[PDB]
Symmetry: C5
Amino acid sequence: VSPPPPIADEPLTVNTGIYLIECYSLDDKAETFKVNAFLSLSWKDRRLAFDPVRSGVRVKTYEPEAIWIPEIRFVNVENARDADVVDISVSPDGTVQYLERFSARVLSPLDFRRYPFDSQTLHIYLIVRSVDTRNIVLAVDLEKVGKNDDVFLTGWDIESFTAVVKPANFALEDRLESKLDYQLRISRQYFSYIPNIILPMLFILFISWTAFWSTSYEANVTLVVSTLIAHIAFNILVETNLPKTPYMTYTGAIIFMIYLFYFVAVIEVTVQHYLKVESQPARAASITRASRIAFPVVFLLANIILAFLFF
Amino acid sequence: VSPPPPIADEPLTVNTGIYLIECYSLDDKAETFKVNAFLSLSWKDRRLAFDPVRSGVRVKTYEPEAIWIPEIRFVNVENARDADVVDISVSPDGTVQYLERFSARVLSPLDFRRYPFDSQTLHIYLIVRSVDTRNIVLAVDLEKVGKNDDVFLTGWDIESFTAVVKPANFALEDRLESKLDYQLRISRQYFSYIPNIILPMLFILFISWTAFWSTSYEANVTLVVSTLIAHIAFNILVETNLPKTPYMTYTGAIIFMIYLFYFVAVIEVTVQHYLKVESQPARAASITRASRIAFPVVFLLANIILAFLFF
Amino acid sequence: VSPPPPIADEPLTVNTGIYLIECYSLDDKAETFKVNAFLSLSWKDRRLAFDPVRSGVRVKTYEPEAIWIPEIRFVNVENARDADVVDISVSPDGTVQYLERFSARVLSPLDFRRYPFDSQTLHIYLIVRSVDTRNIVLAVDLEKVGKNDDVFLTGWDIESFTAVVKPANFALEDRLESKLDYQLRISRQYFSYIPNIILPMLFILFISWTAFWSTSYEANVTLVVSTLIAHIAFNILVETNLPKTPYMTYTGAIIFMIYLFYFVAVIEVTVQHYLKVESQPARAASITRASRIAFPVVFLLANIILAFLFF
Amino acid sequence: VSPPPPIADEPLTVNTGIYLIECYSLDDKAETFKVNAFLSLSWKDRRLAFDPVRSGVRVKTYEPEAIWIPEIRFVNVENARDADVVDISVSPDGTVQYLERFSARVLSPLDFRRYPFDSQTLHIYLIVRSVDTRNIVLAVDLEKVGKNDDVFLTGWDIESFTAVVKPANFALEDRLESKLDYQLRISRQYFSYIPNIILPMLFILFISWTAFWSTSYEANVTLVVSTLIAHIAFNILVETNLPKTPYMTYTGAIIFMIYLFYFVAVIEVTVQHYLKVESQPARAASITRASRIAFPVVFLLANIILAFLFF
Amino acid sequence: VSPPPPIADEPLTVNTGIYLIECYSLDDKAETFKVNAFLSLSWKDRRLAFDPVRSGVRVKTYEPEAIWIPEIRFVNVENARDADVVDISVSPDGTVQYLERFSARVLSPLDFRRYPFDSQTLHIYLIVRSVDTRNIVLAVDLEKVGKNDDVFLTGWDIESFTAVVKPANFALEDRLESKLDYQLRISRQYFSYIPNIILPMLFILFISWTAFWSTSYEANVTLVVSTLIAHIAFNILVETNLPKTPYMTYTGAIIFMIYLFYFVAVIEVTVQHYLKVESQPARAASITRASRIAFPVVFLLANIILAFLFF
Ligand SMILES: [Br-]
Ligand SMILES: [Br-]
Ligand SMILES: [Br-]
Ligand SMILES: [Br-]
Ligand SMILES: [Br-]
Ligand code: NA
């Protein structure tokens, strides 16, 4: 089989469409997601044209091997898609209607800067490489782009599934390549992060601040050091759910900042005891009383500054 | 091969049946389950009619490639089912009896609100796409829907396996689709959660409350902070067995509430010591004595309120 | 190809045998094990009979596609077995000798009640579905049932590999089914559980009891609370190696019971300090002295009771 | 099909090229990385030569089975590459232009000595075994060696993708082998290691040094031992992200050195208390005051020594 | 196809060879390793003999399906090897030279008694089953047994790759079987275990012994209990890298023995405080002073005894 010959110099337009059936396994660490969808393809092959009156049929059904089919590939896939051809139908004017159901693991980079209050634009890049006989260009049939109502991505809200209608045409190894961008916009369901990570992390920090209403150095050391250990536990838990980023994430920034609060609390606790031993408790009392206001105030202002910088 | 021709304008009815052989790997985090079952299909293809007198045999056995077979698919599967054809029997009128044994990983959403006292309705959606020559509709042969007596799903009780007899017929990408809903009702075996998570979590909480019968601030700090650390360990253990939900789970609610009890216990322990140092122990004694009754009472009432809200 | 015709309605007997080459990956949590074995099949096909004096050949070697072979399946397998046909031999009377080497992941429930002093009976269920022309029944050729001497299952002792010679013949979806039960009896190697889990768990518990020879409340709180944290660590480690059971395991029972011992030790430590503060140390001394005998005695008797209930 | 015959006592030159589409899953522990790329092959087959004037065609398209294709393999791959032929084009002189898109998991050793400030040279070794009729040699077509601009490897910076133009020709099992070395140079994005591992590890160490401004032995023991436990947590976290090396890594060296600082801090804390009890506090004061300067100074100098030895 | 006929009473000798290309993924817990190697086979088939003069060829190439090839299998493999035929060459006398490149996951038991200072002998068992027409025996062609210089197994040193030249001929399911033993000798790279597990474990133990220079019971309890918790952490870390053995490992023995040292240290700390409270400090001083020498001495001697018993 060979591609359809150009009636005019015109490049062959392959109309595309992706209909999402299932969305699952968005892996944050791996920056991948699995998809189960319909891929629809449509093009004019004049060699396949027929008269409906003479043939006694209005449609002609072929097997993939019987006719020429464009080699459509995904750019950002781990392995080649697991595809099953559903139907191939030819209209009297030679308009081919191809439909396949596929499943694929898609590589799509994620921006964790606002984690866990982040939104992502997942991409599915459709591509076709031109043949020596003729140039192949991709198009979007908006009527065949969509998603099933039941499509759910665990821990995320699915906003939209649209396609950038104008393809990105470029040269790769002296052949024309036509690339389409299918975009799946999602926003993270941040709810669970509040009672599981944010509030427990705040409680242990506030517990460390009870040392500002205590003169017992031994108890203060126990308060600040023990809660710091609990904070290390949360820092480690958080970084296991996330990949290593060359930037600070919003949660990573808060977690890092809380270490400084534990560090300064230890200094205060040390200074208080040192002055007490040195028989200067009136001075130690001034520092401790100031710390009661300074620590929550600086914590609140530093968080306002961070939320501003990130959102 | 092409579909059987209609005697009139009627759609082709494909009678279905699923018989569960094995149920395994219900993944809570992934919201998936693996299934090993028989898929039975039955349709009339008069082009396969034969005389038993002439052919000698009463029933004809065919290879899947030799005859037309409906393209039956599962909606909610990760990848296409691993299927092995067991039998294809054609009777003299042309009635085909197809039997295959398959294995598949099914995507079925789970409601964790009442975890670990939750029940689920797992779905297996059977689907067929209509062709150009004629429309294909699915039906349920109740005689061929069931499950093996030995079918066990680790950590769950299997209640029923039934099928919604009326298919969901709808248009998808300019063609008819016939969808059947096979429902597997299961209830969680909550037993192990009691001695492994609930009771150890209660013991450490009750241990923190021994600080209400102690005047030693340094020992009280050790009691409440150490048990809080143990509670953090249990919170982390619990959330590793569960996906991130945009709602509170029953266990998640209890675990979160227990943090407030640790926080208020720290306040009490702090207040008690502060008054003692301030030479007001009669007042500290009133707060500590009240706490001995208040903490278990408020804990019991708050748990009654939570159990009411969730069940 | 069609099945061998009967002299009478008498069913076709397919003699079976399984010879284990490799046993590996017994997954306790998944309740699965991987097997690499020989599957031998034998039946009489008179259509394949030949004369021994005329032919000169004593045995004829056929390719699987050339002759009729019964569709033999495993009931309790995750996916269809990975099989490679080794040899097909036909004797003059038409007796077929089929041999294949296969690998499969088998689902076999495990009873953890006596863990880690448990024994299991792993099952490999062989099954054949009857055809319209005639009924197929399974039989055991005991001479072709066995295991390689080198067969080792990491952390287990392999006792026996036998087959229940009488098949379970039953109707399933209007056809006869013949099921054979191949049983692999194994007993757990409990050795490693003693120095890794049982003895370290006992040492930390005995360390908590040194608080019965101490009047220092602050040190006692540190002793009982710290060792309790170490016990939580072991409880969590143990439950990661085991699936969730709707019953108590022997180890789970001991681990749960030890929590009560930590709880009562905290009560004693609290009561001792309360009486001391209340200027009643002679009474506190009576309780502490009693606890020195009571705690090891009640621990020993409670363990005798548990071992009795479980074994 | 047979290889193209030599015009002269010459080997067949197969011009190669690799164009990276996707780079993902660099596993540090496994020392592997996954690749999705184009593999281009070019060789002269005079048997396929044609006249462009009479044929009217500039290029002829062949199916892989229709013509002879060299058996090109990768040396350092886990399993054989998952390949899909994109295009086969023959010029009038008989020059064949082969293009396939493949995916493979590549084994490439990693040097962790300067971790997490390390750089690596990943290798993709192309190989061809000579046939009995003639010797096959590999060459690099630099015009077909490259990478997509969007190629991202999570947690790494991609520097270059070049090929060693001269193949390594050698005898293997009494035949010639032609090996090409494709090199992917990458440098680790160390950023995240600073707020997640390096700075928290420094904070806990500095917290332990507050014991040099405290005379309370009980509080000092709590300070140095608690922070040591937090350091063990970080040591364990670090070694889970890395494979076991027969050499010291830069991070491993720092982590190991910090143990000595905790050990000497315990000795100081012990010596201070011992002298205090021995009624020699003037001496204990001299050691404690010296430790305030000695510990940060020795820590800074030892780190300068280590950074010098490693970089 | 049928096996080559015997000239005489002689069995068919199949000369074998394995050339290791890649060695990876030695899983200690699973007792498996992955291999990528060349498998060479050689046997005489007189039916394929030819005269070089009238043929014009010194060698003849065949496709695997065209000629009889012995069914060579691996005994200790998880699943059947992933094999690709590289070349099949026939010399004038009919000597067939077969070469395939394969990848397989091999089951090979490991002896952990001297871990992490252990050495292993990995096995690759080649096997062939005899046919009714004639007995097939295996042989080793030492010229075709080897390994690539670049073959590296992460965390191990590869010593040798040799084959036991004499096959193990035996009966299995009424047919003779010829088994060859290919041995890969490896020794563990113990280096990393010293700064990561052995020395940190020794430091925490030595820190617990500072309690022998302290009269503060509260601080002593904190010293011995906290370091014991750190030792539990290391015990758990070690047992996650190892399978459960029915014997003691060298590391397991040290780790277990260190628990006894923590236990006796707690007894000493308890005894010291008890005597102090009882107004007998001169006696407590004698026990504490003795413990300063006894604990390091008994630890050193017990380790010499253990190293002797294990090496
Ligand atoms: Br693709
Ligand atoms: Br499906
Ligand atoms: Br099976
Ligand atoms: Br390859
Ligand atoms: Br094999
Ligand atoms: Na303390």
